[PDB]
Amino acid sequence: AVSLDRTRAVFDGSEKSMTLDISNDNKQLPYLAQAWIENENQEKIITGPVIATPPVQRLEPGAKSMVRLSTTPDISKLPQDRESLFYFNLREIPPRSEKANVLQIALQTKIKLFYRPAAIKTRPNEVWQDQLILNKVSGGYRIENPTPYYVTVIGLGGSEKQAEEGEFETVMLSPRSEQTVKSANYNTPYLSYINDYGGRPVLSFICNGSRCSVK
């Protein structure tokens, strides 16, 4: 069972590379781990600006290893005042079953890989998602992300619990952009999002009429 240490990766633009910890937690069998990067639209890229090394590797039972993410020269052509989105993929190749007439199920993990340029380098535990703005509109709310970072919203409701658990179509807002979402009108909306390390904080919103912001 090939496992990856995170559900998203943030690449510090002021660094040349970073590593991702992976492991085969199967006690008796060796696994193959394929790694590669996809672009904003999830299309595989093999010549930068962000590359995954090594492309393929074997992990003997219980073995641990890593995957290196490094940038190429062209990484500089990306905006330096906002994040660029890529995807890190990790697919496992399970030992060929000695059995016959068998369908093997392999796991492919795809996580967001945020290229965050130095000019917008963040500090640990820094919160910028509280800058979101909710504007009531027909259907629900037009959500505005005035920050330089991608913000993934997983919940929106009238109560804090309604935002944590409650049918919501997860949406990711690109840097300096806005999107409208279908939702019931709430006097005190609560929004939930995902931070850099996978935690899921809930924000409390105060609406001044049509506009809602975090105190």
Binding site: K99, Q104, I105, Q108
Partner: protein, 118 residues
Amino acid sequence: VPACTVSNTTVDWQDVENGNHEKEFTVNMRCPYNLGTMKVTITATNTYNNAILVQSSDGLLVYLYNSNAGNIGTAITLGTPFTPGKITGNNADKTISLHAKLGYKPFSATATLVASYS
């Protein structure tokens, strides 16, 4: 938080000469304590009529169905994300019940279970 893990899973067939011999198989994912509703995608290298094309352009066909309380339910559209209809357990020890028919247009076909995290 660490990504979900999937323990080796393989469905069997002894011999059988759009779908013959319904079959029940499970996939249990061990996930992050706070994972929400995330849907998964099942893809394969080669497909046909929404089935996995095993092993020149012809081969065996494996259909996949979203299990429904032991009862076979909606088929699974390969390449499309879906919210499982048969999920049991907690995040730390989840389980997805599925059905796998069979057809044609010692085989060891592979199907990729794609977990794309928001």
